[model samples]
Target chain A: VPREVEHFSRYSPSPLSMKQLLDFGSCERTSFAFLRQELPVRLANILKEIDILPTQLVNTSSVQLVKSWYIQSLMDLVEFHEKSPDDQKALSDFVDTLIKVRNRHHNVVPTMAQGIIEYKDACTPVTNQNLQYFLDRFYMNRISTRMLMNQHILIFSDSQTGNPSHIGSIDPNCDVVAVVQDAFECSRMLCDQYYLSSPELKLTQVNGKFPDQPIHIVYVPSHLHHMLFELFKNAMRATVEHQENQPSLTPIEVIVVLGKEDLTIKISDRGGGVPLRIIDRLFSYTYSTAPTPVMAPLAGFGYGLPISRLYAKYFQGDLNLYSLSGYGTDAIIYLKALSSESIEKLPVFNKSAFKHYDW
Target chain B: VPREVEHFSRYSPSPLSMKQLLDFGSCERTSFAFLRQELPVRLANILKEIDILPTQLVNTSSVQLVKSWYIQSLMDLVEFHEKSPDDQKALSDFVDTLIKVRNRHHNVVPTMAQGIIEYKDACTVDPVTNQNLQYFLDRFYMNRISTRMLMNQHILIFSSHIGSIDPNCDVVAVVQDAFECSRMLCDQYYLSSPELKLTQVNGKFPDQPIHIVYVPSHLHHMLFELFKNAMRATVEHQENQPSLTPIEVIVVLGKEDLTIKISDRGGGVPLRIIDRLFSYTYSTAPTAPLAGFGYGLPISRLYAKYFQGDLNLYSLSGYGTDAIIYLKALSSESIEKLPVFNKSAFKHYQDDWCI
Candidate 1:
C-alpha cells in the first residue's frame, strides 16, 4: 500500500557556481529561496543514484538506513512546498526544519562505506576502479548538497562567527599554516595517547618577502583542517610504528607554500613508505592499513583519506601521495587560491549515467 | 668513395648483467675478454643510431664531433682485433687503449645536448615530435651509460687505487665525500655555500652506516649532481638573507633499499616546469654558475637507474624542493637496466622519418 517516490524531472538540480553562491551574500530571502528550490532536487538525484546501486549492496542494512533518511527528508520537503511561508516566523521554522534534516544525514558517508564492506564480505568482489567511480560521484554530490544547506543555515540562523573575513563557512582569508599546525597538535595528541609517544613536528613556511607572515587563501577552514588532520594522523602513525623499537623517532616535516594559483601543503615523515603493491588501494574506502580496531579508534576506519580527498575535490582541488617504499611518505594537498575558480564540483544524473547504469 | 661502416649482425652487443660483471671477481683475462668482445659492437650500434638521426641534427658541429669519437674508437677496436694478445703486457696495453676511448667520449652528453638545441633553434616542434625526441634521447643516453659503466668499472678494477671497486661500499662515506666535492664547487662559484645538515634519526644514522656492493664513482656522480642543484637553489633563493638556510639530507637504509633525500629551502620551480626538469631541453637555472648545459639532472637520473635504482624530485613552488635517490641495497637484485638496439628502434626511426 506504500507508494514509490517520484523522480521529478522538473525538480532536477541546477548546480550553482561558487561565484553565484557568494553573490547571494547574507540575503536571507534569496538564500532561503535557493535552498527551498534546490535541496529537494538534489535529494531526489541521490535517491535515483542509490536505486541503481548493485542489488546486493542496496539491500544491506546500512544502505537501507541511509535510504530511509533520504526518503524521510524528501517527504518533509514535499510537505513544506505545499504552502509558502506567510510570515518571518514561518520562514524561521522552515529553516529549523532544514537544520534538522542536515543533521539526519551526518553519518551517511561511514554508513555507505559500511554497507559496501558488508557487501564485499559476503563474497562479491568489487573492483576498486568501479567502486571509486561510483563513490566519487555519490560523495561529490553529497558535498555540494551539504554545502548548500550549511551555507543557507549559517546565514539565516545568525550563526556567522561575526568575523568580517568569514562569509558563513567560507573564509576569504584563511591561514593555512595555522590550520596545519593546529591539526598537527590534535593528531599528535591522539598519536601519543595510543602509541604512548609522538614524533616531533617541524612546520616551515616557504613564502617570499614575508616568511614570517601566515599564508592566507579564500577557502573553507573546516575542509582544510579535515585534510591536514587526516594527513598528519597518517604520517604520525606511520612514523611511530616504523621506529617502534628505536630509542628516538624521526620528526615529521610539514612544508606550506602559497603559489600564485594554488596553495600547497606537504606532510613528510620518515615512516617506512607504503608498499608499491598496495599503493592503488591507498585511496579506496574498502582498504585500511591498520587492523580492524577492537572498538572506537583513532585510525582504523579507513574513511579518513577518501573522505579528506572528497573535501579537497569539492572546491576544485586535489590531494596526492608520493611514497618512497622503505623510506618515507609525502602527502601533498593542492587547494585553489582563487575562490572564484574554486567552484562546486557537483555530480549530475544525465543520459550517459543512465545508459551506463541501465542494467 | 669511403665504404660504409658494416653493421655486423654477428657482432651485436650482448649486454652484461651487474651480477655477471661482479661475478668476474677481478680475473684479468675474463674482464679483458668481455670488454674486447663487447665494446666494438656497442660502438657500432652507436654509429648506426647516429646514422639514422635527422639529417639536420647529424650535420651539426656537436653531433659531428661525437660521431668522430665513435668512429675513431671503432677503428681502434678493428685494429686491436687483427690479432689476439700474446702476453700480459699486450693485454695491459689494450686496457690503456680502452681507457683512452672512454675519455674520448667524456663530453659526449653535452655535445649531444648542444646538437639537439641547435636543431630546435632552427624550427618549432609539436608535443608528439618532442615526445619522440625525448624517447630517442632516453634510449640513446641509457645505452651510453651502460657502455660507459662497463668501461669505467673495468678501468677502476685495473687501476692501482685500493678499494676503488668495493664489494661492500660504505654508502654514507661516499655520499659525504660527494657532498664535500659539490660544496667546494658551489662555494668557489657563489663565494658562499649553504650549510649541509645531515639528519641522524637512529643515534648516528641508520644505526649503522649502510654498506652495499656499488661503484663509488657512480654513487658520487648522482649525489654530486643532486647536491649541486640543492646548494645552488638554496643560495640563489636565500640571497637576501644574512645567512643561507641549511640544506638537509636524510639517509635511510632499509632492508631492501637505500634512500637518500636532499631537501633545500630554495624557492621551488613551478609545477608546470617540473615535468621538463628531467628533459635535456630544460634547465631551471641556466644562467647560474656551475650549471652544465642542463645535463646534470637527466644524466644523474640515468646513473641512478643504471643499477635498478631511481631518483625522484618533489618540488613545492614558493617553498623548496626534495630530491630523493632510491637504490637497491642487495647487489644480486641490482641488475643492470640497459637499452638495446633492436628492430623496434630501427622501425621507430623509420616512423619518425615518415612523420
Candidate 2:
C-alpha cells in the first residue's frame, strides 16, 4: 500500500462510528488552528539536519534538507493528529494518509539539481558540454513535481470542510453563493486580524446576475476562500488607512456575477488608490508598506496580493487589480465554469510560471 | 495589468520567432540536456549568499539567506538567458518574469513560519502567546501556501537557467569526473584520514569512452553518493589507517545499458536494518542535525530510477557492502522518450513551502 493509504487507514471510520467522527472532523476551526501552530516546528526541525557547505549549498544541503524535512513533517503531522485521548483513530489516520498522498513524490522523485551541485567543481575539468547537460535537464522535472504538490495540497485542504464557525465549510460541488458566503465569513476574520489598529471597515455584498437556475461548480473551497480573504484584507487595510478622515465611511463593495462560462467577482474600495510609483512592488514578497521593527514584517509578509492571485490562477481563474491613482482600487477575479470537458489539471511551471519566478 | 502579463509584455516574441522557439521547445532532449547542466551553478551562486547557522538553522539567518538567494538567482538566470547572443528576447523575458512569481513566496511566506519559531522562543520574554502564533499561521495557510510549496518552488526556481548547447557526453569521461568529485567529498569529510585507491577491476572498461546521451549530473550524483558512502565506510572499518587497500570498481557496458558495481570492505550494515538503508531517514553515519539529513541512499535510488535505471545494494553482515548503479546508455530512442518522473499527479508538503 502507498504510505498515505497506510497512514489514513486508521481514520477510515467503521460504519458504527461514522457520525461521531464526522462531528469531530466538523471541529474545523480548532483543527485548522492546531495544524497552523504545528507548521513552523516541522519546518524548523528539518533545517536542523542539513549541512550547508559553501561547495554544496542549494542542491545537496538545501534541497536534501527540504525534501527530508517535508517527508518527515508530513509523517509527524499525521502522528500529531492521531494523539487524541479517545481512540478516534479514523480521523487521525485520515489526515495521516492524506498528507502521505500529497507528499508521495519525496519518496519516488530525485533531486537532480543536487546531482549537478555535487560535481560542479569536478565538472569544470570535464567538457563544458557535460556541465551544460546537467543544467538544461535540471528543471524538466520541476513542473511535474510542483503540479503534484499543488493538486495534493489544494484538494486535501478543501476536503477538510465543516463547522462550529462555518468558516471552513464549503462543499466542492456547491453553488456560487455558498462558496462566496464561506469565503466572505473567513474574509471577515482576516480583516479583523489585520485591522486591529485601524478603524473598522464595513464589507457589503452586492449580488448581481445570480442565474435563476442556480448553477453549482466543482471547486476547492479553501482555494476560493483564501483568494477572497486576501483581497478583502487588502481592501479593508487600504480603505481604513487612506480614508480615516473622510466624513462618511465607504463600505467595500463586492459584485458577483455568475454565468454559464464564468463566475466573476469585483471588489471595489475607495482607499485613495495605490501610487503608480510603487504599484509594481505591490505583489513583490519583499515589498511591504507596513512598518518593521520586531514583529511587524511577520504581520502580513506582503503575501496578500501575490498568493491570492496564485490561488485564482490555480483554478483556471484570474485575479486582477486596477487602481484609479487618486480615488479607489478595484480587484476583479474570474473563475472558470466547469463542465463535462473540465480537466482537473494541476497548475504547472511553464513559460508563464517562469515569468513569475524572474523577479 | 496583473504582474505576470506586465513583465512578459516586454519580451513577447514576434509570430515568426515564436514559431521557431516553439519548434525548439519541442526538442525535448536538447532542452532537457541543457537544463541538467546549468542546475548546479545556479544552486551554488544562490548558496553563496546564504548563512546556514548551526544554532538557529532555518530561522532568521537561513530563511533570509534562502529568500534573498532565491530572488538573486532567478534574476541572474533570467539575465543569463537574455545573453543568448541572438535577437530572441521574448522567450527569455517571459521565463524571467515567471521565476519572480515563484520566489515571492520564498521571501514572504516563510516569515510566517519563522516568525512562529521566533515567537515560540519569545513567549518566555514577551507577551506573544501560542494563540497569536497560531493566528498568524492560520492566515498564512488560508493563502494556500506552505513551507513545502516554497521548498519545491526554490528547487525549480533555481533550475530555470541558461540552456546547454552540448549534444552528448562520454560515459567513461563522466565516470572519471564523478570519481574525482567523490574523492573530493570524501577527502573533505575525512580530513586527511585515508587514501581510497580506486581503479577499474578486470579491464572491463570500454575503450572508446562510450558516447552516452545522458545527463552528467545524474551520473555524477549517483556515483558520488555511492562512492562517498563506500569510502567513508571503508575508512571507518580500517579504524583510521593511513594507507589502505583501495575499493574495487567494475564497469560494464552493453549496447544500450551500463552497470557499475562499487564494492567496499567496510563492515556491513546490521541485517535487521538493511531494508531501511534506502529510506530517507536511515543513515548509519551520525553527524550533527545541521550536517546530515540522511538522504544519500534514497536520493541515489531516485537518480537511478529517474533516468530509466535501477540501483541496488548487496551486503554480507560481517563482510562488506557492494553498491551497484545501473543506467540506460543514451540513444535517440531513450533520449526522445526519457523516463521522466512526470507523474504530475495532484499530490503535494508543509516544510517544502516554508522557506
Candidate 3:
C-alpha cells in the first residue's frame, strides 16, 4: 500500500453527529477542512474492508470494477488532502472531484448485486444470514460515505438552486407530501410502462386542513424521495401483478403523518399480501420475488426494501412492514422530525467491527 | 449468594422450541422433570438481572416486593428439584406449589409499574435515558411473559382444562366476551358506552362461527384492551355530539392469518404521541376517569406477539384509528417467540446499553 493510504487506513474516522453537521452551516471554512481530512480516512476504510471480502466474491468482475473505483477515488482524495486548499477556487475544484466520485459509484448497489449473483452461480455455499449481515454493514458504510461527499459538494457548488430552506443537502422545511407525490407519479409511470396499466394513488394527509397544505420536516429531500420511490414501486408492482385478472385495480393508499418525534408515511396496497413463510426474507439482499432476468427493471434485485430501510435508519428512524397474507400490506416509513435527534448511524471499521466481521 | 443459587445463575437456559413442548403431551413425567429443571434456572437468571438494575429502582418498595416473590419461588423450586419427585403424589404436590407461585406473581406487572412511577417521581431523566429505560423494561417484561407462559401451560394442562388448550377455540365467541367485558367497564366509567359493529370480510358461511386451535384467553385479553381503548376514545370525543359513532370490528380469516381490526371514530390521536401509545409510562387520558395505569396496550401487544402474532395501530389523527391484530390461523405455525439467557444477550447490553 502507498504510505498515504496506509496512514489514513490506520486511523478511524470519528462518527459524525447529525446535530454537529447541521450546526456547521453551509460554506463554513471549518466544514470544508473537516471533510478534507474525513473523506480520505473514510475512503481508506472502505477500500480495506473491500479487500477483506471473500476471495470468490472479490474475484467477480462486478466486484473488481467497484474496487477499482474505490482505489482511484482514494488516490484522488489523498492528493487533494495533501494540497490543503484554503482558497475558494481550490475548494470549488475539490467539489468537482467529489461529484465525479459520487457519479462513478452511482450503480454500486446493482453492480454488487451482480457480483453476489455470479458468486452464487459459481456454487459458493453462502448462507442467507451471512449474506444479510455482510450487506447491512457494507451498505451502511456506503450511505455514510456518500452523505459526506454529497454534503460537501452541494455546499460548495453553484447548484444550491437558490432554495433558502435548503442548507446544502439538509432541507430545514422539506415538504414531505410533495416528495411523496413526486415518487408516486414516477412509480406509477414506470408501472404503466411495463404492465400497460397502473393503479391510482389516493394520498391523504392526516394533519392537513386543506388539500394543498404540505407537511414540513427537517430532512434531506433526496433521501426521502429515494425511500418513497422504492416503497411506491413495490406497492404499484404488487397491485398490478396481483390483480391482473380484475377489471379495475384497487387504488393504493398513502397516509402521511407528521408526529412530534417522527414523521411517518404509510403506504398500503391491496396486492394480496406476502406469505408469512417468506416474509422474514423480504429484507434480505439476495431474496427477490421476481423471476430472474426477464427482470423488467421493477424488482428483480431485492435491494429496494433493505436499502430503503437503511436510508430510514440512517437518520435515527425506521421502516416496518405489516402484511395480512391474503388481504393487503402496509409499509410504514418513519423519519426523525427533530434535527438534533437525527444522529448519523455510520459504521466505523474499528476493532469491535473488525472482530464482528472476522468471525 | 449460596452455592445452589450461584450454580443456577451461571448456567444458561436452553432455548425451548414450541414443537418440542407440544410434542410432550399432557401429564407426561418427562414434562414435569423438564419444568423442574427449567424453572429454577430461568428464575435465577431473572433474579441476577434484577439485582443489577439501578439501585434506586431496586430499592423501591414495589420492586423489592417483586424481588421477594422471585426469591420465594426459587427456594420452593430448589427444594422440589432436590426431592426429585418421581411418584404421582409428589408430582401432584409440585403442581400445587407451581400454581401458588403463579398466583403470587399475578400482580408483577402492576407492581413494576409502581416502581417505575416512583423512580420517575424522585428524579428527572433526559429523553435518551428515558428511552434506554423503556428498552430495558421491554426486554424485562418480555422475559417475564415467557416465564409465565410456560408455567401457565403446564398448570392448565394438569387442571380441569385437561388438553392444555382448546383445539377448536371459538374465535367469535371470545371476541364477544371480550367486548362485553370492556363495554361494561366503559359504561361504568362514563355515563354510557359506544355501540360496536362487528362484520366479517367475504364470509363463506355468514352464520357459521370461526374456529382455530388456540389459547382463547390470550385472544380475549387482546380484544378486551383494544375494545376498551376504542370505546373510551369514542365516548370522549363524542361527548358533545347527540350520538356517539359506533366502533367497527372487522374479522378476516385468511389462509394463514386470522386478523381482527378494531376501528374507532374517536378523534384520532396526534401523530407526535402515536409511538408513545405503546410506552408503559405515557397515557393520553391521564386525568380521565377511565385511565388504568397505561399498561393495557403494551401488555396486550406482548400477548399477541408471544405466539408469533402481531398488533399494530394505524391512526388517522384528524379522523379515526385502526388497531389491527394478526395471528397465525394454523396451530402448527403458531410458535412461542422468546428471549433466552445467553452470551448474545449480554453482548446486546454491552453494545447498546446507554444508561
Candidate 4:
C-alpha cells in the first residue's frame, strides 16, 4: 500500500473535516443555489447531500486492504441518507462520504484537475493491435487476490443483433451506441491531450443475437463517470486474478441498440454471474455479513444501483440484470425518449438545441 | 389620510421608495429560517412551496397599519433557506428583522441619528424625560392609526435574594431577585413612562401588600407587542368609545418563585383562555401600520375579557382588585424611570464591549 493515499480522516480526531465519518455540510454556498434552481426542491436536496470528499481515496498501493473498506463505506453512507420510509434501497456512499461532515473547511480541496491525475495512472490503455493482451493482462492482475469482480470497457462498430449490420444497426438497444460514441469521443480527447495509449486495443466488430445495438465505444464520458467507476474498479480486481494463469484472453465487447423510442443496453462480461447468497444482498445497504468492524468511509453504501436506476427512471427508463455463475453476466440499461410535451423538461440549452425535433 | 404620510403601492416604481409589504417578506424569512432548521426534510420542502406574497394587497390611506401575513409565510422561508438551522432570536426588533432578511436591502436602514427624531417620528427613542418631546410626538403620530403598539420599558434590580445567602448555592438555579424588581419596575414604568409623577404612582403602591412582579405575560413575544398596540390604541380611543368602558387590567407580578420546589406546568397560556378573534376588513399593508390607530396590530379583532372578578389569579390582603384604570400625562410633557433589563438579567455591555 502506498503511504500517500491511505485514508480520509473525517472521524475521531476531527468531526468537521472531510475525513469525518458523517457528512452534513456543503462544499460551497453557491452549491445550494445551483441545486435549488436545477431540480425539484425535493429531488435537489437528495442529490445535494451526497458528500464527495474523503482522505486518501483511490489509493494505488493497497487494493487488497482497501476493497473491504470501499464496500463498507458505501453501506454506511446509504444507511445515513434522507429517504422515504418506503425506499428500502437508497444510495448513501456519496452522501455519507461527501456531505455529512462538511463544516465550511476541513479536508483538502478536491478539484477536477486533481481527480483527473489520479484516474490516469489507474487504467489499462487501449490500442489497435493488442486488445486481447491488454484485457488478459488487466483481468489477470486484478484476479490475483481471488477477487470476484469482473468489469471491462469495449467499443464495437458495424455489428448487428440477429445478423451483422449492413448499415448502422448492431445490438438491439440504442443506448449502447450512444454510450460507445461518448466513450470514444472522451477517450480520443484524453489520448490526444494527455498522450496516453494502450497497445492492446484493436478495431473489430462481432455480431451476436443480443437485444442491444453494437457501436464503436472508445471510452469515458462525464455523464457515464459513475458507471465507468463501477466498471474500472471491478476490472482492476479481475486483472490481478487473470495474470497468474493466463497469457492472453479474448477482449470483451458490449451490445448497444438504437430504437426510435429509446436506447437499450446490455453489458455482457466474460466472468461468471453474481454468487447466490450475495444475490439478495446485491445493491442493498446493510448487506455486509462481516462481524462488527470499523466501517470504511464512502459516498454511499447500498446506493449506487438505486441511484442509477432511479435517475434513469426519471427519463422513463429502467435497469435490470441476468447472470450465470460459470459464464459472465449481462446488465440491461434503458433510456426513454421524451414525449412532445415533455420536451419542456429540458432547460434552456437542451430545449433550444433539440427544438426542431420537438415539434 | 395625507398622501405624504401613507400610500400602498405594490410596485414602488423607484428604488428610493418603499411600501410596508416588505415587512411581511422580512417576517416570512424569519419564520422560514426557523421552520427550515427544525422540521424534517420532505415536510420542509412542502412548506416552502407555498407562495405568500399577496398580489391583491389592499390599497389603504394610512393613519397607520401593520404588515400582516399568515404564519404560512414563515413556513415557506424555512423551506427555502439552504442552511443555518440554529439561530438566536434577538432583543431588538431591528435585530429580529435584520436576522431574517440579511440579503434584502431597502428603506428600512437603521441610522444612529434615529434617536434624535421627534416623538411623532422616531420609534427608537427610550422612554425617559431626557428624550426630545417633538420626536416622541411624531412617533406617536406615525404609530397613530391602528398603531396600538403600546411599548413600555422597565428597569429590574436583582439586589437581594434569600436563597443566595447559602454558602455554596448552585448559582445556576438561583432565581434572580430582579425578576421581582422587574415586576415592580414594569408597574412603575407603565405608570410613570406615560408621564405619571412618582408621588402619584407611589400613592397607588402604598395601600397594596407585597408588590407583584410581572412579565408582560403575553404568550408569544410578537403578541406582546401587538397587545401593547391594542392597549395604547384603547387608551387613545377614550374620545371615540366614550360610551364604552375599559376592562380591568392586571400586571403579572413575577415568576421568580418559579420552581421553589413546587408543582407547576410550564407556564404557557391556559388552553381554555377565551379566544379573541378579529373580523375586520382593513389594509395595513396599504398604509403604513405605524402611523395610525394600531388596530392593525390587533387588526379586525375584538376582545371579550372575563367579566369583572373572574380571571385575576392573585389578590393582596390589603387591597381589593389588583386591577385598576391606568393614566399618565402625554409623554412629551412628563415621564419617570429609565428602561432597564429585569434585574434578573441586565447588562451595561454585550459581546466585547466594556461597560
RMSD (Å) per prediction: 7.5, 30.2, 5.2, 30.9
For the predicted complex of model 3, DockQ is: 0.22
The deviation in Å at residue A171 for candidate 3 is: 6.3
Models 1 onward score TM values of 0.73, 0.32, 0.80, 0.22
Q: Give a tens-digit lDDT track for model 2, residues B1-355.
A: 1232223223311111212222353333343233322332333322321222222433555355544544454444445443433334533453444355444545554553454356345446232333333322222232222222222323343341113112345555666677777777666766532344443311123354444445566677778778778777777777766665577765555444566667776755533355567543446656412125455676677656543466777543334566766666543323211111111210110011111
**Model 1: residues >4 Å from true position, as ranges?**
A1-21, A24-108, A119-165, A196-211, A242-262, A268-285, A306-330, A340-359, B1-17, B26-107, B154-165, B200-206, B286-288, B339-355
Q: Which structure is stronger by TM-score: 1 or 4?
A: 1
The residue pairs that clash in candidate 3, if any, are A260-B272
Candidate with the larger DockQ of 1 and 2 = 1
Tens digits of per-residue lDDT, candidate 4, A25-110, equal 11222222222122222111111111221233233333222333333433433334354433323222222233322221122112
Q: TM-score of model 4 relative to the true fold?
A: 0.22
Model 2 residue runs over 4 Å out of place are A1-64, A70-97, A100-175, A178-215, A292-299, A339-359, B1-355
In candidate 1, the residue pairs with backbone N, CA or C atoms under 3 Å apart (3 or more residues apart, or in different chains) clash, namely none
For residues A314-339, could you state the per-residue lDDT of candidate 3 as single tens digits?
87778888776666788988777678
What is each predicted model's overall lDDT from 0 to 1? 0.74, 0.46, 0.76, 0.25
Global Cα lDDT for candidate 3: 0.76
Give each prediction's DockQ, rounded to 2 decimals: 0.12, 0.01, 0.22, 0.00
Highest DockQ scorer: 3
The ten-residue window of minimal lDDT in model 2 chain B covers B345-354
